Design a binder for this molecule. Structure first.
Ligand SMILES: CC(C)[C@H]1NC(=O)c2c[se]c(n2)[C@@H](C(C)C)NC(=O)c2c[se]c(n2)[C@@H](C(C)C)NC(=O)c2c[se]c1n2
Length: 1188
């Protein structure tokens, strides 16, 4: 993974930028050391109560002389301590504000220049750059990687400096207040980073082991869902459900262990930090009895050091974000500092005023940049006279268009030069070159705007009248005037789709507006019907007037009208001259003449479900029974801590017998380690309870889910929201993550309710007014912590949604770069981009201010809470209300308990994502279809007749109830006789075949099989005797024997049936010939096969079940040569003794059908045999008159 040097990355910072960064950092530093200072002052705070405990404990000394020496003293000390606390907080809001605000600000101002110059840089690149690069990922880079470099030069490093300042502040205050104790805790430190480092490796080892564990089930997942039509059709749903399941109980069982080890990692962590508490206090409290360190000093150094330690942990992601931001900056700066071979942005060449129009190509050697290994043009020589129209032909290779591509100077020749007049094409400016060179591509292209605007892109300073005149010059003024909104009619990608002819003509106009003296036409008529081709070529011929025109077309019809015809054989131009010369010399030209004669949309729709998801995991009560109790223990573990902590310093603040200062000390210290042991117990237990639970739940769930998917109708997979990828992804992620809402959430809610629950009881007994103040302050800060992540993500989305206005412009400007570059106007697109950017950049100032005041609002009262609680608490302890130890206890319980619930909320997966990803699962499983293939109901007679009779039956697709497909068409087919379907196109060609297979339910009307209605029969048994062959047959990545045997399920197929079904489909010859026999895998993972052979296998497939009904629907549209003959020959011998329904567009193998049905609109307007309908001179006579 690459990265830019740090200095190079802030290259686009300036005066004010460097200023903002420096001031910001300076604020970050002082914000950082604020917390350790708060710790020192905390120690200096406890050291004062320590003196008022011991005196008032032992016996009695002075009743009237204590209120003056103690009560009046502590008020006088807390009146200054309050100033210290509140002071530091009041400063903190300011310094935090400057920090976040300024960093965010400067960052934004840099990014703004970065994205723009990135866009400009992409545009500056020549097409040779676009050839070797993927425009798809480049387009995404402009949004994702610039956003990625935005994060990591802003708030993140502000919080990095703050974090490091908290580190050094903590260690400095530590060493300044305490020498020994700091070295103690730091001596404990290297066993934590050694532990967090090995346990991270263990969890990451099984994590990458899961990816390629379940992938063996995802393979048979995507394979099924992709081939689903043939699956339901061949009813292999059972064998496929099983085949899927057999790869589940080997991939998540691997995950059980990982869940376990993860929990053990967390447990070990708590064990070791609790151990550090035990040891640290065991040393410090024994250090205060020898009256070396005070009690408050122990706290000062312990807190400051621990805080400075965790500061790095909270500095780690902030420096990681800076890191990978440099990695992104590498790609972007690369493009910006890159000046291409052709610029193409500033004039450096001449601008001829003649301007003539004489073309010349002298000794052109050129090969494409993508493949330097294959040379294209070798000594290309070709001159073109003024106004003379020259055509290119020969069917050599890309060379043709390459010449055209060389002409607008897209590429530059390897050897030789392309000269216009007496000057080379490189000795002239490139902008001006392409302004005087028009071009019409093989595929037209229009930008999402108005026709008028699409024209403007050819020339900006054109009046409406000029636009009109130009439109007329392209024979486009007719249909455009017919458009509803005239010239303001929308076009392009989204809105008002046009025909290829119209779209192309508009482009002819666009080019014509430039008034070029040279006109290039690369397959302009190509990919167009014979009717539009007339008008298009008509405009073109009138556009070749007064202009020097080179033209390449696949159709030699419009070629003979040129002045010079040039032929291409290999890399050189061999035959050149008039039409008659090339006809007379019988060249390549003559030979050709004779040879040619959804992510958001998904998550939005489901409502629900409040805690019903748990009912899914409910199948295993015990794991949860142990889990909940364990969770309550691990939860009550935290309140215990804050109690025992308050008891450590309590015995050194409330005095008492000095002889009992040690006896107590060592008790509590050791007890902490005890509190550690049980903490490693709970997590070891939890990882066996919930950990297993959600995993079993996962496996099981997927099974159910997958089964559910196979139950659905075919109408559900046609639904635009359910694709094989989205379904397999739904299966791979949301099915696993459901566990989040089951065990883990119970664990969290119980650890929380135990912690804050029991903890609030304790703090309520040890304090009335103080606890009531704390249960007031803490929730208020907690609400702020929510609002913090509300206005953060909230205005994070608002910024992106106003950034799509740019994203569109960029995207359109990139995917059609090769187009715009020929119309120049790249700078016009840049200007559009900036005009789109000017609005969210203006909202970056207010943005920074907002992040500022929000962050500072949260951060400010985080110290004011200390100030309030300790002031009020001091007010308590000083007066008759007791005591200090109780103040510290209440504080610790409620506050650090409240932080504890934060950590517990952060552990488990996100409940929101869990629930929404669960709802899809519960809806998918509980989804009852119209057509059920699992039902064990149905007739199943003894009659092997098979008569198909559609009566009435009007149908329309559920996906799109617009222009119904079947308007109640009717027909009938008897046994043996085969039907034929003829029409303009599909619908309802395929629809009928699909209805017999029962893929849909017609709104009104019925379809009868034999004497019974279809809906009365068994769904599966109906498809048990229905054979089906689509246009593009698919096989399974298993094997051939299984593929053939896949036709008939719920039975042992064996060698006999397969060889018998192979020999009659005429595929047996191809099997022994290619090593080895039947064991081969198809396809893509094994030996590839041509469509012919694969389809033959697909026939031998449908033939195994001995179907009395074959459904043939546009079987072979892509089969050529003598491969289509043997296929249909193999078909003909299996069409006897079976009812068949054939659909073809060939119209040459329908002449021998028994019945031929001409379906038009939504009904049958012609029926009978071939010659019968032929003598009818209806629509069948006009449809068969195109066979010449
Ligand atoms: C250190 C920071 C990560 C962070 N710790 C936690 O957010 C946390 C989440 Se569970 C937990 N801590 C447990 C647990 C670690 C045993 N410890 C306590 O409940 C506890 C009772 Se007294 C006390 N801490 C003192 C300390 C210094 C004795 N801590 C602080 O003044 C302090 C200010 Se921020 C912060 N700590």
């Amino acid at each position: 993974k690459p990265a830019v040097s740090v200095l190079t990355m802030f290259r686009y910072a300036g005066w004010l930028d460097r200023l903002y960064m420096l001031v910001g950092t300076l604020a970050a530093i002082i914000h950082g050391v604020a917390l350790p200072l708060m710790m020192l002052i905390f120690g200096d705070m406890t050291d004062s109560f320590a003196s008022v405990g011991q005196v008032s404990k032992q016996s009695t000394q002075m009743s009237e002389a204590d209120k003056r020496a103690m009560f009046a003293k502590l008020e006088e000390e807390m009146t200054t301590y309050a100033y210290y606390y509140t002071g530091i907080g009041a400063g903190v809001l300011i310094v935090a504000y400057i920090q976040v605000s300024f960093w965010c600000l400067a960052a934004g101002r840099q990014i703004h220049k970065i994205r723009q110059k990135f866009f400009h840089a992409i545009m500056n690149q020549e097409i040779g750059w676009f050839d070797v690069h993927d425009v798809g990922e480049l387009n995404t880079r402009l949004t994702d990687d610039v956003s990625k470099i935005n994060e990591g030069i802003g708030d993140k490093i502000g919080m990095f400096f703050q974090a490091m300042a908290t580190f050094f502040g903590g260690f400095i205050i530590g060493f300044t207040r305490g020498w020994k104790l700091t070295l103690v805790i730091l001596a404990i430190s290297p066993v934590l980073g050694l532990s967090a480092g090995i346990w991270a490796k263990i969890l990451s080892s099984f994590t990458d082991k899961e990816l390629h564990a379940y992938a063996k089930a995802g393979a048979v997942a995507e394979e099924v869902l992709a081939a689903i039509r043939t699956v339901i059709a061949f009813g292999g749903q059972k064998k496929e459900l099983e085949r899927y399941n057999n790869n589940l109980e080997e991939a998540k069982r691997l995950g059980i262990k990982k869940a376990i080890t993860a929990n053990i990692s967390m447990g070990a962590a708590f064990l070791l930090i609790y151990a550090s508490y035990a040891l640290a206090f065991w040393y410090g409290t024994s250090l205060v009895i020898s009256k070396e360190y005070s009690i408050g000093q122990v706290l000062t150094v312990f807190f400051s050091v621990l805080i400075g330690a965790f500061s790095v942990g909270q500095a780690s992601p902030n420096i990681e974000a800076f890191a990978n931001a440099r990695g992104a900056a590498y790609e972007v700066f690369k493009i910006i500092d890159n000046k291409p071979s052709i610029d193409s942005f500033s004039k450096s060449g001449h601008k001829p005023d003649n301007i003539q129009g004489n073309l010349e190509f002298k000794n052109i050697h050129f090969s494409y940049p993508s493949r330097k290994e294959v040379q294209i043009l070798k000594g290309l020589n070709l001159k073109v006279k003024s106004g003379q129209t020259v055509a290119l032909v020969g069917n050599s290779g890309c060379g043709k268009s390459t010449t055209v591509q060389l002409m607008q100077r897209l590429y530059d020749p390897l050897d030789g030069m392309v000269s216009i007049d007496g000057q080379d094409i490189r000795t002239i400016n490139v902008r001006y070159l392409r302004e005087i060179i028009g071009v019409v591509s093989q595929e037209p292209v229009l930008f999402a705007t108005t026709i008028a605007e699409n024209i403007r892109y050819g020339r900006e300073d054109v009046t409406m009248d000029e636009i009109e005149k130009a439109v007329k010059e392209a024979n486009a003024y007719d249909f455009i005037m017919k458009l509803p909104h005239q010239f303001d009619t929308l076009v392009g990608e989204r809105g008002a789709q046009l025909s290829g002819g119209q779209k192309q003509r508009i482009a002819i106009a666009r080019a014509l507006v430039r008034n070029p003296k040279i006109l290039l036409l690369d397959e302009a008529t190509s990919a167009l019907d014979t009717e539009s081709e007339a008008v298009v070529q008509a405009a073109l011929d009138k556009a070749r007037e007064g202009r020097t025109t080179i033209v390449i077309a696949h159709r030699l019809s419009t070629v003979r009208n040129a002045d010079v015809i040039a032929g291409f054989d290999g890399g050189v131009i061999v035959e050149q001259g008039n039409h008659d010369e090339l006809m007379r010399e019988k060249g390549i030209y003559f030979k050709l003449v004779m040879t040619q004669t959804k992510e958001a949309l998904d998550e939005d729709v489901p409502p629900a479900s409040f805690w019903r998801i748990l009912k899914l995991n409910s199948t295993e009560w015990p794991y949860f029974v142990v889990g909940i109790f364990c969770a309550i223990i691990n939860g009550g573990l935290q309140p215990a801590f804050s109690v025992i902590f308050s008891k450590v310093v309590g015995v050194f603040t409330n005095g008492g017998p000095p002889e009992t200062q040690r006896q107590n000390s060592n008790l509590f210290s050791l007890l902490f380690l005890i509190l550690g042991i049980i903490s490693f117990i709970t997590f070891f237990l939890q990882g066996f309870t919930f950990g297993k639970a959600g995993e079993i739940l996962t496996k099981r769930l997927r099974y159910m889910v997958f089964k559910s998917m196979l139950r659905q109708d075919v109408s559900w997979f046609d639904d635009p929201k359910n694709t094989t990828g989205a379904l397999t992804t739904r299966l791979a992620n949301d099915a696993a993550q459901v566990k989040g809402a089951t065990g883990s959430r119970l664990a969290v809610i119980f650890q929380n309710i135990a912690n804050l629950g029991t903890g609030i009881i304790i703090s309520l007994i040890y304090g009335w007014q103080l606890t009531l103040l704390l249960l007031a302050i803490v929730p208020i800060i907690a609400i702020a912590g929510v609002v913090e992540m509300k206005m953060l993500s909230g205005q994070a989305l608002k910024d992106k949604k106003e950034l799509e206005g740019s994203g569109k412009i960029a995207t359109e400007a990139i995917e059609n770069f090769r187009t715009v570059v020929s119309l120049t106007r790249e700078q016009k697109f840049e200007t559009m981009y900036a005009q789109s950017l000017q609005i969210p950049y203006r909202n970056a100032m207010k943005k920074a201010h907002v992040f500022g005041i929000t962050f500072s609002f949260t951060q400010a009262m985080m110290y004011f809470s200390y100030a309030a609680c300790f002031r009020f608490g001091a007010y308590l302890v000083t007066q008759q209300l007791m005591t200090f130890e109780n103040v510290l206890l209440v504080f610790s319980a409620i506050v650090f308990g409240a932080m504890a619930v934060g950590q517990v909320s952060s552990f488990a997966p996100d409940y929101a994502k869990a629930t929404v990803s669960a709802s899809h699962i519960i809806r998918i499983i509980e989804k009852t279809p119209e057509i059920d293939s699992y039902s064990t109901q149905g007739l199943k007679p003894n009659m092997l007749e098979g008569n198909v009779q559609f009566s009435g039956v009007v149908f329309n697709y559920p996906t799109r109830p617009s222009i119904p497909v079947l308007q109640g068409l009717s027909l009938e087919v008897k046994k043996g006789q085969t039907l034929a379907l003829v029409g303009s196109s599909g619908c309802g060609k395929s629809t009928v075949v699909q209805l017999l297979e029962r893929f849909y339910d017609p709104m009104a009307g019925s379809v009868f099989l034999d004497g019974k209605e279809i809906k009365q029969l068994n769904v599966q048994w109906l498809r048990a005797q229905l054979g089906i062959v689509s246009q593009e047959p698919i096989l399974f990545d298993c094997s051939i024997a299984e593929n053939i045997a896949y036709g008939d399920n719920s039975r042992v197929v064996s060698y006999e049936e397969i060889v018998r079904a192979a020999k009659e489909a005429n595929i047996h010859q191809f099997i022994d010939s290619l090593p080895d026999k039947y064991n081969t895998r198809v396809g893509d993972k094994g030996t590839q096969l041509s469509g012919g052979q694969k389809q033959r296998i697909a026939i031998a497939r449908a033939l195994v079940r001995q179907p009395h009904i074959l459904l043939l629907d546009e079987a072979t549209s892509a089969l050529d040569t003598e491969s289509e003959k043997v296929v249909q020959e193999a078909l003909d011998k299996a069409r006897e003794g079976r009812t068949c329904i054939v659909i073809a567009h060939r119209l040459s193998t329908i002449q021998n059908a028994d019945l031929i049905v001409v379906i038009q609109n939504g009904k049958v307007k012609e029926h009978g045999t071939h010659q019968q309908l032929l003598a009818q001179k209806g629509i069948y006579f006009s449809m068969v008159s195109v066979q010449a």
